Amino acid sequence: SHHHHHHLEVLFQGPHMSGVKVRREDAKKVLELLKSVGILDGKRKAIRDEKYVIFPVTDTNIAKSLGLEVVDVELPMRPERQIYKNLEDLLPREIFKKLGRLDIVGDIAIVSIPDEILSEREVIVSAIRKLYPKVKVIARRGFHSGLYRIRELEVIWGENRLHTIHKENGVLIKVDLSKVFFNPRMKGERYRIAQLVNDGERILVPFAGVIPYPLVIARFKNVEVYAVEINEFAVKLAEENLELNRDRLKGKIKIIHGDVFEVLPNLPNFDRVVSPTPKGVDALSLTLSKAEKFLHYYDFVHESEIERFRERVLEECRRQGKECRVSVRKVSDYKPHVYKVCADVEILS
Numbered sequence: 001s002h003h004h005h006h007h008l009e010v011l012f013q014g015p016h017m018s019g020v021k022v023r024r025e026d027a028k029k030v031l032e033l034l035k036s037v038g039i040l041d042g043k044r045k046a047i048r049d050e051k052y053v054i055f056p057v058t059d060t061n062i063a064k065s066l067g068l069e070v071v072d073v074e075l076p077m078r079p080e081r082q083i084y085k086n087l088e089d090l091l092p093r094e095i096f097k098k099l100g101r102l103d104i105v106g107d108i109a110i111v112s113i114p115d116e117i118l119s120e121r122e123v124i125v126s127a128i129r130k131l132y133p134k135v136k137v138i139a140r141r142g143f144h145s146g147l148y149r150i151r152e153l154e155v156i157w158g159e160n161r162l163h164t165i166h167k168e169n170g171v172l173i174k175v176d177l178s179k180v181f182f183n184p185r186m187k188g189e190r191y192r193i194a195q196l197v198n199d200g201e202r203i204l205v206p207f208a209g210v211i212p213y214p215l216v217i218a219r220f221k222n223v224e225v226y227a228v229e230i231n232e233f234a235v236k237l238a239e240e241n242l243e244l245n246r247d248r249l250k251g252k253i254k255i256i257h258g259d260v261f262e263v264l265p266n267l268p269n270f271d272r273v274v275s276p277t278p279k280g281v282d283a284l285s286l287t288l289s290k291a292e293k294f295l296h297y298y299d300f301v302h303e304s305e306i307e308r309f310r311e312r313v314l315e316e317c318r319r320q321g322k323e324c325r326v327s328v329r330k331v332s333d334y335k336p337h338v339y340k341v342c343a344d345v346e347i348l349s
């Protein structure tokens with residue numbers, strides 16, 4: 001006998017060759033419509049010109065029932081392989097250029113998205129997921145708030161969580177970005193100072209957070225590191241991090257829950273002080289006062305202020321009756337015309 005038409009109609013083996021032609025101002029509306037109705041063809045790319053977009057569809061009869069103009073076109077096939085290296089490869093320049101730098105913490109991607117391009121959130125998320133297929137959370141960042149410098153963060157894709165375990169320089173760092181400050185970009189600096197350190201040193205790190213600096217130093221050197229942190233949630237994670245890394249640390253770490261400006265005057269002095277100073281805070285006198293051989297003092301300085309910065313460090317050295325060599329390094333581009341810097345102070349005997 002013969003077959004039912006509603007069985008035969010699925011048998012055609014060829015590929016779809018049609019799309020719908022829509023005004024650009026209608027493109028987002030129509031893309032949503034095509035997906036909801038279920039006739040968007042994932043096999044092919046959409047294309048555009050100056051005025052119109054063409055979406056690939058799987059059923060032109062249904063497209064007509066949606067009031068859409070059907071066109072016969074030769075659209076590109078979806079890519080089977082990927083060779084994108086960076087975000088710029090996946091976004092138009094007008095969008096990418098407005099994006100802040102992207103940071104990865106554990107399996108969380110963090111990016112700043114100005115209100116002006118927030119309307120492009122979908123393609124931004126798509127681009128980030130493509131570039132980082134292992135990321136499980138994407139968050140939009142604002143500024144740091146409060147004494148603990150917690151970053152304003154909104155999850156815009158993935159799991160609704162801001163805690164993860166970050167890997168750096170051979171150590172494991174538990175972080176909860178909803179509760180503590182963390183600085184992934186300091187990876188190079190932390191490794192640098194860890195290599196400079198010598199076995200046997202006693203080292204102080206004020207403003208220590210979940211103690212990434214003490215962990216990286218103690219990973220590579222048999223030293224004792226005192227860490228001072230005021231945020232009790234950061235202290236908790238620091239304790240958990242110490243236990244998490246305990247069997248891989250050569251050195252020892254002492255975590256002190258407290259206010260740096262209260263704690264340091266009551267401490268003994270140290271061979272080396274490493275101060276990842278909160279932006280805007282001046283802890284130069286106090287941290288130098290605890291150093292016997294080396295201070296590494298981080299700060300944020302406008303380029304035109306860079307020389308004044310060095311002379312202020314030298315002034316404090318003389319003020320404390322110390323003879324020092326001071327070297328200033330640009331550590332990172334913080335924003336236009338402003339650098340994160342480090343004063344390396346060598347105290348001479």
Ligand SMILES: CSC[C@H]1O[C@@H](n2cnc3c(N)ncnc32)[C@H](O)[C@@H]1O
Nearest residue numbers: 148149207209229230231259260278
């Ligand atoms: C950018 S701030 C870096 C870390 O220093 C901590 N911090 C800020 N001020 C102090 C202080 N006075 N004493 C101890 N830790 C501090 C913050 O909670 C954060 O974890």
